[PDB]
Amino acid sequence: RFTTGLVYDTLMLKHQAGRIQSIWSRLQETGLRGKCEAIRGRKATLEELQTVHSEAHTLLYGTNPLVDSDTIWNEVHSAGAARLAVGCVVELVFKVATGELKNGFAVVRPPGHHAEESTPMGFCYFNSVAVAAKLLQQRLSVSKILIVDWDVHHGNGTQQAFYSDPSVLYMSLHRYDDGNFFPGSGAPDEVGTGPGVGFNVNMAFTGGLDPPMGDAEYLAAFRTVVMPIASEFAPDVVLVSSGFDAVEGHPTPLGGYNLSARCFGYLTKQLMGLAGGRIVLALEGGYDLTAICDASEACVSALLGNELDPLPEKVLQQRPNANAVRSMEKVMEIHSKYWRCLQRTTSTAGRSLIEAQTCE
Ligand SMILES: O=C(c1ccc(C(O)(O)C(F)(F)F)s1)N1CCn2c(-c3ccccc3)cnc2C1
Ligand SMILES: [K+]
Ligand SMILES: [K+]
Ligand SMILES: [Zn+2]
């Protein structure tokens, strides 16, 4: 059936209910699982992993040496789970990209976007989303790939992986606060290198939690930075590093923002307007079970084409806070040098959604 894909595998579970098991259960209980096609995953091959990572890294963490969660064998299993997470994502990406499925959501762990060429970090061993993109390039010759990363932390590995490639547009929305938030990378001025100059976009929020960024601020960032640039780029496939740690309920250092889960349904629906709807979302961060389950539900519902719960009038009427406007305007200023959609006008970043619409 030409519909929404899901990927999930119990061999990724720690105990052999955590995050991915709670999400899977929510999708079952709400009936959304019933409307999707659940595919079978597989371990990534060592060669696939080596499209992004070094042979030495892949051999060390990818190979089995041959479980109490409070021993070193917990981390050995997590590295195994990571190898499996990459093959689950690759499989879903290819089924959507070939037209077998319309779109997809990958319920996987551990996350991948912090993993660098030969350095695991931030709970990440292998960069699943980056590996998928490389394989779409090398095996299907896909001309344009947009990667959107809306986990609250900068996706340092994915930026690295494509920093000189103009055929892949990497766009990260993250808390930055002038280099004082993990992992410390992803300044707005990091725009790419060589031929890839201008094809790396760091929508970096600065100013701290005075006040925290919420729905109005991210919707405005999408209106002003993400969709204008993404539309002009005109990708053939969209991949999303879909972390949900920006949702309300994730405290100050391991989160700090007050997004609603509902807002991610709307962000998804917007992204569904590109690439003919060829979109796959892969779970990254977020850890509050209720928040990540609410958000995963909202995203899958959007992908299935269901009618979304209307955002509260309060959100639609809210002008973004001054820190958010300052942050958006700094990003636009830098990227006007590279994108026609940012050269034409002056900033309307301070308007609410209704105001932006009314003035059009
Ligand atoms: O910010 C992170 C994250 C690592 C990975 C994060 C993620 O992006 O949400 C991912 F990768 F899991 F999806 S978020 N840190 C910094 C704080 N931290 C800690 C803390 C230790 C002491 C006090 C507060 C936090 C343990 N491990 C970490 C990793
Ligand atoms: K991000
Ligand atoms: K790039
Ligand atoms: Zn995160």
Is the torsion defined by CA of 191, 197, 198, 200 positive or negative? negative
Atom 19 (ligand 1): residue with closest C-alpha? 254
Q: Which residues of 92-119 are buried (b: 16+ CB within 10 A; e: fewer)?
A: bbbbbbeeebbbbbbbbbbbbbbbbeee
**Ligand 1, residues at Cβ distance < 6 Å:** 111, 114, 122-124, 151, 153, 182, 243, 245, 253-254, 284-285
The number of angstroms, rounded, from the C-alpha of 174 to the middle of its chain's C-alpha atoms is 11
Nearest alpha carbon to residue 243 among 282, 285, 279, 202: 285
Mutation to probe ligand 1, out of 124, 153, 247, 252 (largest number of atoms < 8 A from CB): 153
Look-up: residue for tokens 């992993």?
A: 49
Indicate the Cα dihedral angle 324, 326, 328, 334, nearest 10°: -160
CATH superfamily of 1-360: Histone deacetylase domain (3.40.800.20)
Q: Which spans in the chain are helix H?
A: 19-29, 32-35, 46-49, 55-62, 73-97, 128-140, 156-161, 215-221, 227-233, 261-271, 289-303, 313-317, 322-335, 353-358
Contact in structure between 309 and 301 (CB atoms under 8 Å): no
Atom 24 (ligand 1): residue with closest C-alpha? 253
Atom 10 (ligand 1): residue with closest C-alpha? 285
Rounded Cα distance between 356 and 239, Å, is 27
Q: Cis ω on the peptide bond leading into residue 212 (within 30° of 0)?
A: no
Ligand 2 midpoint to CA 137 (Å): 22
> How is residue 126 annotated by DSSP?
S
Rounded Cα distance between 174 and 327, Å, is 11
Elucidation method:
X-ray
H/E run at residue 113: none
Ligand 1 midpoint to CA 89 (Å): 23
Rounded Cα distance between 338 and 340, Å, is 7
Mutation to probe ligand 1, out of 126, 182, 240, 241 (largest number of atoms < 8 A from CB): 182
Cβ burial of 182 (10 Å; 0-12, 13-18, 19+) is: middle
- What is the side-by-side strand order in the sheet with 145-149? 37-39, 4-7, 103-106, 279-283, 237-242, 145-149, 168-175, 200-205
Q: Which ligand is nearest to the CA of 241?
A: 2
Atom 3 (ligand 1): residue with closest C-alpha? 122
- What region does 298 belong to: left with phi over 0, alpha with psi -120 to 50, or beta? alpha
The contacts of residue 246 (CB under 8 Å, 6+ apart) are: 150, 151, 152, 175, 213, 218, 255, 257, 259, 286
Q: Is residue 114 annotated as a catalytic residue, yes or no?
A: yes
Look-up: residue for tokens 């590093």?
A: 241
Residues of the chain with a following break (C to N over 2.5 Å): 16, 66
How far, CA to CA in Å, does 340 sit from each of 144, 176, 287, 332?
18, 26, 38, 11
Q: Which ligand is nearest to the CA of 201?
A: 3
This structure's resolution (angstroms)? Answer: 2.2
> 204: which strand partners?
174
How far, CA to CA in Å, does 69 sit from each of 14, 16, 96, 333?
7, 10, 35, 48
Token output for 128: 């699943």
Is the torsion defined by CA of 82, 184, 159, 286 positive or negative? positive
Rounded Cα distance between 247 and 251, Å, is 10
> How is residue 277 annotated by DSSP?
G
Mutation to probe ligand 1, out of 254, 287, 288 (largest number of atoms < 8 A from CB): 254
